[PDB]
Coordinates of C-alpha atoms in Angstrom, one line a residue:
Chain A
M1 CA 0.1 0.2 0.0
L2 CA 1.8 3.3 -0.7
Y3 CA 1.1 6.3 1.6
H4 CA 2.2 10.0 1.3
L5 CA 3.6 10.8 4.6
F6 CA 3.9 14.5 4.8
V7 CA 5.8 16.6 7.1
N8 CA 4.6 17.4 11.1
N9 CA 1.0 14.9 9.7
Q10 CA 1.3 11.7 9.6
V11 CA -0.9 8.3 7.9
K12 CA -4.0 6.6 9.0
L13 CA -2.8 2.3 7.5
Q14 CA -5.3 1.0 6.3
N15 CA -4.5 -1.9 8.7
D16 CA -2.3 -2.9 11.7
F17 CA 2.2 -2.3 11.3
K18 CA 3.1 -5.9 12.7
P19 CA 4.8 -7.8 12.3
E20 CA 5.8 -9.0 9.1
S21 CA 5.1 -5.9 8.2
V22 CA 7.7 -3.9 6.2
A23 CA 7.7 0.0 5.9
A24 CA 9.6 1.5 2.7
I25 CA 10.1 5.0 3.3
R26 CA 11.9 7.1 0.8
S27 CA 12.7 10.4 0.0
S28 CA 12.9 12.8 -2.5
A29 CA 15.7 14.9 -1.8
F30 CA 17.9 14.6 1.4
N31 CA 18.0 18.9 2.7
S32 CA 22.1 18.7 4.3
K33 CA 21.3 21.4 6.5
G34 CA 18.1 20.1 7.6
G35 CA 17.5 19.7 11.9
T36 CA 16.0 16.9 14.2
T37 CA 13.7 14.5 12.3
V38 CA 11.3 12.7 13.8
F39 CA 9.6 8.9 12.6
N40 CA 6.9 7.7 15.1
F41 CA 5.2 4.5 14.3
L42 CA 1.9 5.2 16.9
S43 CA -0.7 2.4 18.5
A44 CA -4.7 3.5 18.0
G45 CA -4.1 4.8 21.4
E46 CA -1.3 6.9 20.2
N47 CA 1.4 5.1 21.8
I48 CA 4.5 5.5 21.2
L49 CA 5.7 2.4 19.8
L50 CA 8.4 3.2 18.2
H51 CA 10.1 6.7 18.1
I52 CA 13.3 7.0 15.0
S53 CA 15.0 10.2 15.9
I54 CA 17.6 11.7 13.3
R55 CA 19.7 14.3 14.9
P56 CA 22.7 15.8 12.2
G57 CA 23.3 18.6 15.2
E58 CA 24.1 15.6 17.8
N59 CA 25.5 12.5 14.6
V60 CA 22.6 10.4 16.0
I61 CA 20.0 8.5 15.3
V62 CA 17.6 8.0 18.6
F63 CA 15.2 4.9 19.0
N64 CA 13.1 5.0 21.5
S65 CA 8.7 4.2 23.0
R66 CA 6.4 5.9 25.2
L67 CA 2.8 5.6 26.4
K68 CA 0.7 8.3 25.0
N69 CA 0.9 9.5 28.8
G70 CA 4.0 8.5 30.0
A71 CA 7.6 9.5 29.9
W72 CA 10.2 8.4 27.2
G73 CA 12.5 5.3 28.5
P74 CA 16.5 4.7 28.5
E75 CA 17.2 5.9 24.8
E76 CA 19.3 3.6 22.2
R77 CA 21.3 5.7 20.3
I78 CA 23.4 5.2 16.6
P79 CA 25.8 6.8 14.7
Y80 CA 24.0 9.3 12.2
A81 CA 26.8 10.0 9.6
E82 CA 27.2 8.0 6.6
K83 CA 23.5 6.4 7.1
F84 CA 21.8 8.0 4.1
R85 CA 22.4 8.6 1.1
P86 CA 21.7 12.2 -0.4
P87 CA 19.3 12.4 -3.1
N88 CA 16.7 9.8 -2.4
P89 CA 17.5 8.8 1.8
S90 CA 15.4 5.9 2.7
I91 CA 14.7 4.4 6.2
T92 CA 13.3 1.0 6.1
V93 CA 10.8 -0.9 9.5
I94 CA 10.0 -4.5 9.3
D95 CA 8.0 -6.2 12.3
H96 CA 10.0 -9.3 13.5
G97 CA 7.6 -10.2 16.1
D98 CA 10.0 -9.3 19.3
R99 CA 11.7 -6.2 17.6
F100 CA 12.0 -3.8 15.6
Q101 CA 14.3 -4.3 12.5
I102 CA 15.4 -0.2 11.1
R103 CA 18.0 0.3 8.5
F104 CA 18.5 3.4 6.0
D105 CA 21.1 3.3 3.6
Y106 CA 24.6 2.5 4.6
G107 CA 25.7 0.4 7.6
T108 CA 24.4 -2.7 9.0
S109 CA 20.7 -3.4 10.2
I110 CA 19.7 -1.4 13.7
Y111 CA 17.7 -3.8 16.1
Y112 CA 14.9 -2.3 18.3
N113 CA 13.3 -5.2 21.4
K114 CA 9.4 -3.7 21.6
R115 CA 8.9 -2.4 24.5
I116 CA 4.7 -1.9 23.9
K117 CA 3.8 -4.8 23.1
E118 CA 0.5 -3.7 21.0
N119 CA 0.5 -3.5 17.0
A120 CA 1.1 0.3 14.9
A121 CA -1.9 1.7 13.5
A122 CA -0.3 4.8 12.3
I123 CA 2.7 6.4 11.1
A124 CA 3.8 10.2 11.8
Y125 CA 6.6 11.8 10.3
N126 CA 7.6 16.0 12.5
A127 CA 10.4 18.5 11.5
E128 CA 10.7 22.6 11.8
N129 CA 13.9 21.7 9.1
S130 CA 13.5 18.7 7.6
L131 CA 16.7 16.7 6.5
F132 CA 13.9 15.2 3.8
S133 CA 11.1 15.3 1.4
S134 CA 7.6 16.3 2.5
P135 CA 6.4 14.9 1.8
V136 CA 8.2 10.9 2.5
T137 CA 7.3 8.3 -0.3
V138 CA 6.0 5.5 2.6
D139 CA 5.4 2.1 1.3
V140 CA 3.7 -0.9 3.5
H141 CA 3.7 -4.4 3.0
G142 CA 1.6 -7.1 4.9
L143 CA 5.5 -9.3 4.3
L144 CA 8.5 -9.5 2.7
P145 CA 8.0 -8.7 -1.6
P146 CA 9.4 -11.5 -4.3
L147 CA 12.8 -10.0 -4.2
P148 CA 14.9 -9.2 -7.1
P149 CA 17.7 -10.8 -8.1
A150 CA 19.6 -7.6 -7.3
Chain B
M1 CA 15.5 8.4 -8.9
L2 CA 12.5 9.3 -7.3
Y3 CA 10.6 12.4 -7.6
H4 CA 7.1 14.1 -6.2
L5 CA 5.2 15.0 -9.0
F6 CA 2.8 18.3 -7.4
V7 CA -0.3 18.8 -8.9
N8 CA -0.5 21.5 -11.8
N9 CA 3.2 21.3 -11.3
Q10 CA 6.5 19.5 -12.8
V11 CA 10.0 17.9 -11.8
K12 CA 13.5 18.6 -13.9
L13 CA 14.8 15.2 -14.4
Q14 CA 17.8 14.9 -13.4
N15 CA 18.8 13.3 -16.1
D16 CA 17.1 13.3 -20.3
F17 CA 14.7 10.3 -20.5
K18 CA 15.7 8.7 -22.9
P19 CA 15.5 4.9 -24.9
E20 CA 15.0 2.7 -22.6
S21 CA 14.2 5.0 -19.7
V22 CA 11.3 4.0 -17.2
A23 CA 8.5 6.1 -15.4
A24 CA 6.3 4.8 -13.1
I25 CA 3.9 7.0 -11.9
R26 CA 1.9 5.6 -8.7
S27 CA -0.4 7.1 -7.1
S28 CA -1.6 7.4 -3.4
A29 CA -5.1 7.8 -3.7
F30 CA -7.9 7.7 -7.0
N31 CA -10.7 10.3 -6.5
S32 CA -13.6 8.3 -8.4
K33 CA -15.4 12.1 -8.8
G34 CA -12.1 14.2 -10.0
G35 CA -12.1 15.3 -13.7
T36 CA -9.7 15.4 -16.1
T37 CA -6.1 14.7 -15.5
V38 CA -3.2 15.2 -17.5
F39 CA 0.4 14.3 -17.6
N40 CA 3.2 15.7 -19.9
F41 CA 6.3 14.6 -21.3
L42 CA 7.9 17.9 -21.7
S43 CA 11.6 18.5 -23.7
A44 CA 14.1 21.6 -22.9
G45 CA 12.5 23.6 -24.9
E46 CA 9.1 22.8 -23.5
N47 CA 7.9 20.5 -26.6
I48 CA 4.8 18.0 -25.3
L49 CA 6.7 15.2 -26.5
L50 CA 3.8 12.7 -24.8
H51 CA 0.5 14.1 -24.0
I52 CA -1.8 12.3 -21.7
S53 CA -5.3 14.0 -21.2
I54 CA -7.3 11.1 -18.7
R55 CA -11.4 12.7 -18.8
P56 CA -13.7 10.4 -16.8
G57 CA -16.0 13.3 -18.3
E58 CA -15.9 12.1 -22.1
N59 CA -15.0 8.7 -20.9
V60 CA -11.1 8.4 -22.7
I61 CA -7.9 9.1 -22.3
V62 CA -6.7 11.0 -24.9
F63 CA -2.4 11.4 -26.3
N64 CA -1.2 13.8 -28.4
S65 CA 1.6 15.5 -28.5
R66 CA 2.7 19.6 -30.0
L67 CA 5.5 22.0 -30.3
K68 CA 5.5 25.1 -27.1
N69 CA 3.9 27.2 -29.7
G70 CA 2.8 24.7 -31.8
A71 CA -1.1 23.5 -32.8
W72 CA -2.5 19.9 -31.5
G73 CA -1.4 16.7 -33.2
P74 CA -3.9 14.5 -34.2
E75 CA -5.5 12.8 -31.3
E76 CA -5.4 8.8 -30.2
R77 CA -8.1 7.7 -28.2
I78 CA -8.9 4.7 -25.2
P79 CA -10.7 3.9 -23.4
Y80 CA -11.3 5.3 -19.9
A81 CA -12.8 2.7 -18.0
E82 CA -10.6 -0.8 -16.9
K83 CA -7.9 0.9 -16.6
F84 CA -7.1 2.2 -12.9
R85 CA -6.8 0.0 -9.9
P86 CA -7.7 2.1 -7.0
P87 CA -7.0 3.0 -4.4
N88 CA -3.7 3.3 -5.5
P89 CA -4.2 3.0 -9.5
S90 CA -1.1 3.2 -11.9
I91 CA 0.8 4.5 -14.7
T92 CA 4.0 3.2 -16.4
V93 CA 5.4 5.2 -18.6
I94 CA 8.4 3.5 -21.3
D95 CA 10.7 5.1 -24.2
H96 CA 11.4 2.1 -26.7
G97 CA 13.5 4.9 -29.3
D98 CA 10.7 5.1 -32.4
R99 CA 7.3 4.8 -29.1
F100 CA 6.3 5.1 -25.8
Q101 CA 4.8 2.2 -23.9
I102 CA 1.9 3.8 -21.3
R103 CA 0.8 1.1 -19.4
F104 CA -2.0 0.8 -16.7
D105 CA -3.0 -1.1 -14.0
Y106 CA -5.7 -3.1 -16.8
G107 CA -5.4 -3.9 -19.8
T108 CA -2.7 -5.1 -22.9
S109 CA -0.2 -1.6 -23.2
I110 CA -0.8 1.6 -25.2
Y111 CA 1.8 3.1 -28.1
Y112 CA 1.9 6.0 -29.5
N113 CA 4.6 6.4 -32.2
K114 CA 6.7 9.5 -31.2
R115 CA 6.2 12.3 -33.1
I116 CA 8.6 14.6 -31.7
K117 CA 12.1 13.3 -31.8
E118 CA 14.0 14.8 -28.2
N119 CA 14.2 13.2 -25.2
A120 CA 12.0 14.4 -22.4
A121 CA 14.0 16.6 -19.7
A122 CA 10.4 17.7 -17.7
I123 CA 6.8 15.5 -16.3
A124 CA 4.6 18.5 -15.8
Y125 CA 1.1 17.3 -14.4
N126 CA -2.6 19.1 -14.1
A127 CA -5.6 19.3 -13.1
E128 CA -8.7 21.1 -11.3
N129 CA -9.6 18.7 -10.1
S130 CA -7.3 15.9 -9.7
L131 CA -8.4 11.6 -10.7
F132 CA -5.2 11.1 -8.7
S133 CA -3.4 12.1 -5.1
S134 CA -0.4 15.0 -5.3
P135 CA 1.7 14.7 -5.3
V136 CA 2.2 11.6 -6.9
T137 CA 4.8 8.9 -6.2
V138 CA 7.6 9.1 -9.7
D139 CA 10.6 6.4 -9.9
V140 CA 12.0 7.1 -13.5
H141 CA 14.8 4.4 -14.2
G142 CA 17.7 4.7 -17.2
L143 CA 16.9 1.3 -18.0
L144 CA 14.4 -1.4 -16.7
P145 CA 15.2 -2.2 -13.6
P146 CA 16.2 -6.3 -12.1
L147 CA 12.6 -7.7 -11.8
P148 CA 11.3 -9.4 -8.6
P149 CA 9.7 -12.9 -8.7
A150 CA 6.6 -11.3 -9.5
Chain C
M1 CA 6.3 -18.9 -13.5
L2 CA 9.6 -20.1 -12.1
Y3 CA 11.1 -22.7 -14.9
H4 CA 14.9 -24.3 -14.9
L5 CA 15.4 -24.8 -19.3
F6 CA 19.0 -27.2 -19.5
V7 CA 21.3 -26.7 -22.6
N8 CA 19.7 -28.7 -25.7
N9 CA 16.3 -29.1 -24.5
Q10 CA 13.3 -27.0 -23.4
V11 CA 10.2 -26.3 -21.0
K12 CA 6.4 -26.4 -22.1
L13 CA 5.5 -23.8 -20.4
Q14 CA 2.2 -22.9 -18.3
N15 CA 0.5 -20.4 -20.5
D16 CA 1.4 -18.9 -23.9
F17 CA 3.6 -16.3 -24.2
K18 CA 1.9 -13.7 -25.7
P19 CA 1.8 -9.8 -25.8
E20 CA 1.8 -8.3 -22.2
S21 CA 4.4 -11.8 -21.1
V22 CA 7.9 -11.8 -20.0
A23 CA 10.3 -14.3 -19.9
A24 CA 13.6 -13.0 -17.6
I25 CA 16.3 -15.5 -18.6
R26 CA 19.0 -15.8 -16.2
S27 CA 23.0 -17.5 -16.3
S28 CA 24.4 -18.5 -12.8
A29 CA 28.0 -18.6 -14.9
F30 CA 29.7 -17.2 -18.2
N31 CA 32.3 -19.0 -20.1
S32 CA 34.1 -16.7 -21.9
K33 CA 36.0 -19.9 -24.2
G34 CA 32.4 -20.8 -25.5
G35 CA 31.0 -21.2 -28.9
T36 CA 27.7 -20.8 -30.1
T37 CA 24.6 -20.2 -27.8
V38 CA 20.7 -20.2 -28.6
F39 CA 16.9 -19.8 -27.2
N40 CA 14.5 -20.7 -28.8
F41 CA 10.9 -19.1 -28.9
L42 CA 8.9 -21.9 -30.0
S43 CA 4.7 -23.2 -30.9
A44 CA 2.6 -25.6 -29.6
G45 CA 3.2 -26.6 -34.0
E46 CA 7.2 -26.0 -33.5
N47 CA 7.2 -23.1 -35.5
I48 CA 10.0 -20.5 -34.8
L49 CA 9.2 -17.7 -34.0
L50 CA 11.8 -15.9 -32.3
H51 CA 15.1 -17.6 -32.9
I52 CA 18.6 -16.2 -30.6
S53 CA 21.8 -17.1 -31.5
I54 CA 24.8 -15.8 -29.1
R55 CA 27.9 -16.1 -31.6
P56 CA 30.9 -15.1 -29.9
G57 CA 33.0 -15.8 -32.8
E58 CA 31.2 -14.1 -35.1
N59 CA 31.3 -11.9 -32.7
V60 CA 27.5 -11.0 -33.6
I61 CA 23.5 -11.8 -32.0
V62 CA 21.7 -13.0 -35.1
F63 CA 17.8 -13.0 -34.7
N64 CA 15.6 -15.1 -36.9
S65 CA 12.2 -16.7 -37.9
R66 CA 11.5 -19.9 -39.1
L67 CA 8.2 -22.5 -40.0
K68 CA 9.1 -25.6 -38.5
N69 CA 9.4 -27.0 -42.5
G70 CA 10.1 -24.0 -43.6
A71 CA 13.5 -22.0 -44.6
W72 CA 15.0 -19.3 -42.2
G73 CA 13.8 -15.5 -43.6
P74 CA 16.6 -13.1 -43.0
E75 CA 18.7 -12.7 -40.7
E76 CA 18.7 -9.4 -37.8
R77 CA 22.4 -8.6 -36.6
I78 CA 23.4 -7.0 -33.7
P79 CA 26.9 -7.2 -32.3
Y80 CA 28.1 -9.8 -29.6
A81 CA 30.9 -7.9 -27.8
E82 CA 29.5 -5.7 -24.3
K83 CA 26.3 -7.6 -23.5
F84 CA 26.5 -10.0 -21.2
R85 CA 28.1 -9.0 -17.1
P86 CA 29.6 -12.4 -16.3
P87 CA 29.3 -14.0 -14.1
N88 CA 25.8 -14.0 -14.1
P89 CA 24.3 -13.0 -17.3
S90 CA 21.1 -12.7 -19.2
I91 CA 18.5 -12.4 -22.0
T92 CA 15.2 -10.6 -20.5
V93 CA 12.2 -11.5 -23.7
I94 CA 9.4 -9.3 -24.1
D95 CA 5.9 -9.2 -26.4
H96 CA 4.9 -5.7 -27.3
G97 CA 2.6 -7.6 -29.8
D98 CA 3.4 -6.0 -33.2
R99 CA 7.3 -7.2 -32.5
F100 CA 9.9 -8.3 -29.3
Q101 CA 12.2 -6.8 -27.4
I102 CA 15.0 -8.1 -26.6
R103 CA 17.4 -6.9 -23.8
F104 CA 20.9 -8.3 -22.7
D105 CA 23.3 -6.9 -20.1
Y106 CA 25.0 -3.5 -21.8
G107 CA 23.6 -1.4 -25.2
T108 CA 20.3 -0.7 -25.8
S109 CA 16.9 -3.2 -26.3
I110 CA 16.7 -4.6 -30.0
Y111 CA 12.9 -5.3 -31.5
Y112 CA 12.6 -7.0 -33.7
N113 CA 8.6 -7.3 -36.1
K114 CA 6.9 -10.4 -35.4
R115 CA 7.0 -12.3 -38.5
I116 CA 5.0 -15.6 -37.5
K117 CA 1.5 -14.2 -35.9
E118 CA 1.5 -17.3 -32.8
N119 CA 2.1 -17.6 -29.2
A120 CA 4.6 -19.3 -28.0
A121 CA 4.3 -22.7 -25.8
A122 CA 7.7 -23.4 -25.6
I123 CA 11.7 -21.8 -24.6
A124 CA 14.2 -24.2 -26.9
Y125 CA 17.9 -23.5 -25.2
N126 CA 20.9 -25.1 -27.5
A127 CA 24.4 -25.6 -27.8
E128 CA 27.4 -27.0 -28.3
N129 CA 29.9 -25.6 -25.9
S130 CA 27.2 -23.0 -24.0
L131 CA 27.8 -19.7 -22.7
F132 CA 25.9 -19.9 -20.1
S133 CA 25.0 -22.6 -16.9
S134 CA 22.9 -25.5 -18.3
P135 CA 20.0 -24.6 -17.2
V136 CA 19.6 -21.2 -16.9
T137 CA 16.8 -19.9 -14.6
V138 CA 13.3 -18.7 -16.1
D139 CA 10.7 -16.7 -15.1
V140 CA 7.8 -15.8 -17.4
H141 CA 5.4 -13.4 -16.1
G142 CA 1.8 -13.3 -18.0
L143 CA 2.9 -9.2 -17.3
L144 CA 5.3 -6.3 -16.5
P145 CA 5.5 -6.8 -12.4
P146 CA 5.7 -4.2 -10.1
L147 CA 9.3 -2.3 -10.2
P148 CA 11.7 -1.9 -6.9
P149 CA 13.2 2.4 -6.9
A150 CA 15.8 0.9 -8.3
Chain D
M1 CA 24.8 -13.4 -6.8
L2 CA 22.9 -16.2 -8.8
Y3 CA 24.1 -19.8 -7.7
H4 CA 22.3 -22.8 -9.7
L5 CA 22.1 -25.7 -6.3
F6 CA 21.7 -29.7 -7.1
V7 CA 20.3 -32.3 -4.9
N8 CA 23.9 -33.8 -2.6
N9 CA 26.1 -31.7 -3.8
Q10 CA 27.3 -28.0 -3.0
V11 CA 27.8 -24.1 -4.0
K12 CA 31.1 -22.4 -2.0
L13 CA 29.7 -18.5 -1.8
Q14 CA 31.6 -16.0 -3.8
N15 CA 31.3 -13.6 -0.9
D16 CA 30.8 -14.4 3.0
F17 CA 27.2 -14.6 3.7
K18 CA 27.0 -12.9 7.1
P19 CA 24.7 -10.3 8.8
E20 CA 22.5 -8.6 6.4
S21 CA 23.5 -11.4 3.8
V22 CA 19.5 -12.8 2.2
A23 CA 18.8 -15.7 0.4
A24 CA 16.7 -16.3 -1.9
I25 CA 16.1 -20.1 -2.8
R26 CA 13.1 -21.0 -5.3
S27 CA 12.2 -24.5 -6.5
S28 CA 10.9 -24.9 -10.0
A29 CA 8.6 -26.9 -8.7
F30 CA 6.7 -29.8 -6.0
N31 CA 7.5 -33.3 -6.1
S32 CA 4.7 -34.1 -3.6
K33 CA 5.6 -37.6 -2.8
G34 CA 9.4 -36.0 -2.2
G35 CA 10.8 -37.6 1.3
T36 CA 13.3 -35.6 4.3
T37 CA 14.5 -32.5 2.3
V38 CA 18.0 -30.7 3.6
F39 CA 19.5 -28.0 3.2
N40 CA 22.8 -26.5 5.1
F41 CA 24.8 -23.6 5.4
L42 CA 28.0 -24.5 5.6
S43 CA 31.1 -22.3 7.1
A44 CA 34.8 -22.5 5.6
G45 CA 35.5 -25.4 8.2
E46 CA 32.7 -27.3 7.3
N47 CA 30.7 -26.7 10.1
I48 CA 26.5 -26.8 10.3
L49 CA 25.6 -23.5 10.5
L50 CA 22.4 -23.7 9.6
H51 CA 20.5 -27.0 9.6
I52 CA 17.1 -26.7 7.5
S53 CA 15.5 -30.6 7.7
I54 CA 11.9 -30.6 5.6
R55 CA 10.7 -34.0 6.8
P56 CA 7.4 -34.6 5.0
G57 CA 7.0 -38.4 6.8
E58 CA 6.8 -36.8 10.3
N59 CA 5.5 -34.2 8.8
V60 CA 7.7 -31.2 11.1
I61 CA 10.6 -29.1 9.5
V62 CA 13.5 -29.6 11.9
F63 CA 16.9 -26.6 12.6
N64 CA 19.3 -27.3 14.2
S65 CA 23.2 -26.9 13.8
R66 CA 26.7 -29.0 14.7
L67 CA 30.5 -28.5 14.3
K68 CA 32.3 -30.4 11.4
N69 CA 33.3 -32.9 14.2
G70 CA 30.9 -32.9 16.8
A71 CA 27.0 -34.1 17.5
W72 CA 24.1 -32.6 16.4
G73 CA 22.1 -29.6 19.2
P74 CA 19.2 -29.9 20.3
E75 CA 16.2 -29.8 17.5
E76 CA 13.5 -27.2 17.5
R77 CA 10.5 -27.9 15.5
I78 CA 7.9 -26.1 13.6
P79 CA 4.8 -28.0 11.4
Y80 CA 5.4 -28.8 7.9
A81 CA 1.7 -27.7 6.8
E82 CA 1.4 -25.2 5.2
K83 CA 4.2 -23.9 4.4
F84 CA 5.0 -24.3 0.9
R85 CA 3.5 -23.5 -2.4
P86 CA 3.7 -25.7 -5.3
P87 CA 4.3 -25.4 -8.1
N88 CA 7.3 -22.6 -7.4
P89 CA 7.5 -23.5 -3.3
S90 CA 10.6 -21.4 -2.1
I91 CA 12.5 -21.0 1.2
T92 CA 14.5 -16.7 2.4
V93 CA 17.4 -16.8 5.1
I94 CA 18.4 -13.9 6.2
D95 CA 20.8 -13.5 8.8
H96 CA 20.6 -10.4 11.4
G97 CA 23.2 -10.7 13.2
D98 CA 22.0 -12.7 16.6
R99 CA 20.2 -15.0 14.3
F100 CA 18.5 -16.1 11.4
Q101 CA 15.1 -15.3 9.7
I102 CA 13.6 -18.7 7.9
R103 CA 10.3 -17.8 5.9
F104 CA 8.4 -19.6 3.3
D105 CA 5.0 -19.3 1.1
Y106 CA 2.6 -19.1 4.3
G107 CA 2.5 -18.1 7.7
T108 CA 5.2 -16.1 10.4
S109 CA 9.1 -16.2 9.9
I110 CA 10.9 -18.7 12.1
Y111 CA 13.7 -17.8 14.1
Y112 CA 16.9 -19.4 14.5
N113 CA 19.2 -18.8 16.9
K114 CA 22.7 -17.9 15.8
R115 CA 24.7 -21.5 18.1
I116 CA 28.3 -21.2 16.1
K117 CA 29.2 -17.9 15.2
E118 CA 30.8 -18.2 11.8
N119 CA 29.9 -17.2 8.6
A120 CA 28.9 -19.5 6.3
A121 CA 30.7 -19.7 2.4
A122 CA 28.6 -22.6 1.0
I123 CA 24.9 -23.9 0.8
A124 CA 24.8 -27.8 0.6
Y125 CA 20.9 -29.5 -0.6
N126 CA 20.8 -33.0 0.1
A127 CA 17.9 -36.2 -0.3
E128 CA 16.9 -39.3 -1.7
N129 CA 14.1 -37.9 -3.5
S130 CA 14.1 -34.0 -3.0
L131 CA 10.4 -32.3 -2.6
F132 CA 12.4 -29.7 -4.5
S133 CA 13.0 -29.1 -8.1
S134 CA 17.3 -30.3 -8.9
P135 CA 19.0 -27.7 -8.9
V136 CA 17.4 -24.8 -7.2
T137 CA 17.1 -21.7 -8.2
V138 CA 19.6 -19.3 -5.5
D139 CA 19.9 -15.7 -5.8
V140 CA 22.1 -14.7 -2.6
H141 CA 22.3 -11.0 -1.7
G142 CA 24.7 -8.9 0.7
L143 CA 21.7 -6.6 1.9
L144 CA 18.2 -6.7 1.5
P145 CA 17.8 -5.0 -2.1
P146 CA 15.5 -2.3 -3.0
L147 CA 11.8 -4.0 -2.9
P148 CA 9.2 -3.4 -5.6
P149 CA 5.8 -1.6 -4.4
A150 CA 4.1 -5.2 -4.4

């Protein structure tokens, strides 16, 4: 399913993002002078199951989770540099049941253990000066689709 | 190369759309009550190499070409019905040297012989009440990419 | 549909190879010291609709057609050099109704006007010392499948 | 990279199968009356990193590991039923660092924690009366390739 996720907005998924689900987020640009850029996978109750905070200024990408009216938990990090490939940077999130796999354009995948056992119903995108285009292209699959030879 | 083509606007191509090139246009939605929706492949001099005019009101899809300061040439029509697949209808245009191949979601491919021998430097999208989303996701290839088993 | 086409043998297609059909033939190797290698798309009546003769010794790739008990017609050619990419060379054939599009790994596509208006029921592979592996992987589609970003 | 893995034989990988790697194994057929069919991912020292034992007779699929000159470790079983889709059943193995992801044609992915920390240098295929074709088409990726919209 194709969605157009606009900055400081969200998209309601036709189906729950759950184990086996894949979200292929692609940007039509890379604004090298952009600031903190966030992608959140939300549950129906608006609990932030997966928070992805790309912070060029801090040269790090933070992953976290929190209930709608709860406190952020400990942050998990990975360096920002050499993760995105301009001019079409991307983020791919896959639900593996007990954890999330997040792949950017370079480097190895990041694995984040689920903290809030609930499926996602929407995906949000926030930024005051996004590193990416608005909107970003998002193809969501219920399962890994067939793969081309390369 | 991924581009986001907004309605009543256009995108300048990083490279010339020429033989072997492929443009996969995908809409995040289908607006059943939409009106005439157009897609133009323009050369650097603004000549309309390929005019795709979807007319639900006339229940037809029209193809044509014309120079920047010239009149339209003869029209080529095909049925509008049974072409687009909601909620993510699509259009795929391939340059085969002497002609363009246009594929929709249903039916056999449509072939339009080239009338203006120039490569396209841009793609335009116009509509007062677009049948499709704005923007539309557009992936342009320099050549057919590797194919998945399905 | 996936098939394993062995050298000096053939595969009977589950469905007729016809307009919109795509055959993605891939080899698991490139034997640089191989000789003339042939791929034929046959009709039920065993008429050779498309004959693809790769001749390294003559540095050319010949395309032709002939009825089961008929004579070969005029040959159409294209240089052999810089067409295949080792170690996994490929050939992609697409039926466009009035002609065939044949793409290798490099260079522009080759277009061959149909001479025998009939659909194909089988694909044959012949060679005494094939440039390719035995068998070759062959995925046949009833129509162009969705395309990955690249 | 495309390989053709013949039954009761193996293929040496051009590169190490390691984290991020993906092996898409596809059979050109399904032999309903076939017997126990095995796929092994072996390290350079011939240690069996991942043993995939499909047992229709026991109606189960077994996963295990062992050193070249060692005994088998504890077995992990899953149902055989509702896994493979004829006529072209498939198996997809992805290396996620600390574990392997194994996907068949139906059902959710199976995860097998790594037991031997070595990368695989080869893939073996054994069976007296294989459930699958011989050879099997195998596409090995160094990382997840771009995904088609479907």
